């Protein structure tokens, strides 16, 4: 009695069809007897019909800047219906690829933020935030904050609880991130929080004390930045580690040949700020470690203590510096996120 009906997720003649979602077709009062989608070159798009014959959907990534033609026929006891629909997908001016840290499957410390760094400036930060889905278990409140025009961070109010699972789905493919810039692809990463490791460098004592789940496990004499190039106070996130590295002040904005410049090969170096602070082996200053500050800002320790730090501290662990004559590490350093007050971080800066 009733003629079958076709309903597609696109309209014939549409332009700017976004490719963040599959294209589908549904039949009512009948079943789908044939569904094909081809691009402007005639090549078919992969799809799948549901077992009950009522719903077809694309099953592969749809492309930017394509003209697709969908042909569908529904058949029912009451007759047949055929439709042909042609539509154009989004045509980006630019593409941007996101890069996520930390790495997939990593175990990181209680200070590790989620980091999503785009390779282009993001004109619509809110669109980017909306496209990033963070799952936590146990669930905890967190929020986004932009360090610069390309990199956004997500973290909770307080250091993570050990044993928390964190899942990051950056679903930017087909999403307009402003001014015609679209996501180059999706990215999906997962990590876990390990032991709580917090090392405190107190300028009053010139000791760097490492605590693991609240217990003191190591007490390292240190020499921090001299009064003219002091170590900033505050909370530092542990970054990369190196068995050896050439520390080149030009990497951190300071000409080597300038008064505060340097180019030094050091062993057992753990990065704790993008501004170039490391914990590292300093055989030349062992006499001053635990007594006086001599460095350009780095936390000088002994060879054995630097190796110990390399072996026992991981990305996302915390170093807190207190009581120096320096200022406070900038919240937007790169590893300084925890120095931003929570009310300010939570409010964000997407606008
Ligand atoms: O996503 C984590 C972010 O926190 C920063 O401390 C480090 O650069 C990486 O671990 C990353 O950029
Ligand atoms: N490092 C160089 C200058 C580097 C730079 O300007 O980036 C020098 O002092 O010799």
Author numbering: 57 to 407
The authors write:
Among the five L,D-transpeptidase paralogs of M.tb, LdtMt2 plays an important role since an M.tb strain lacking the gene encoding this enzyme exhibits attenuation in virulence and exhibits enhanced susceptibility to β-lactam antibiotics. The L,D-transpeptidase class in M.tb is comprised of at least four substructural domains including two immunoglobulin-like domains (IgD1 and IgD2), a YkuD domain, and a C-terminal subdomain (CTSD). The YkuD domain has a highly conserved motif HXX14-17[S/T]HGChN containing three residues analogous to the catalytic triad of cysteine proteases: a cysteine, a histidine and a third residue (Cysteine 354, Histidine 336, and Serine 337 in LdtMt2) to catalyse the transpeptidation reaction.
The crystal structure of LdtMt2 was solved at 1.57 Å resolution. This high-resolution crystal structure is an improvement of our previous efforts that enabled us to identify an electron density in a pocket between the IgD2-YkuD domains, and a glucose molecule could be modelled into the electron density at 1.0 sigma. The sugar molecule is ensconced at the IgD2-YkuD domain interface in a pocket, which we referred to as the S-pocket, making several electrostatic interactions with residues R209, E207, E168, R371, Y330, and A171. Three residues M157, A171, and L391 stabilize the sugar through hydrophobic interactions. Superposition of the structures of the LdtMt2–sugar complex with the LdtBS–PG complex suggests that longer nascent PG chains thread across the S-pocket in between the IgD1-YkuD domains of LdtMt2. Based on the structural details of PG binding in LdtBS and LdtMt2, a PG chain was computationally placed over a positively charged surface across the IgD2-YkuD domain interface encompassing the S-pocket. This computational modelling of a longer PG chain spatially aligns one of its tetrapeptide stem across an inner cavity of the catalytic site in YkuD domain in LdtMt2, similar to reports of carbapenem and a PG-moiety binding in the same position.
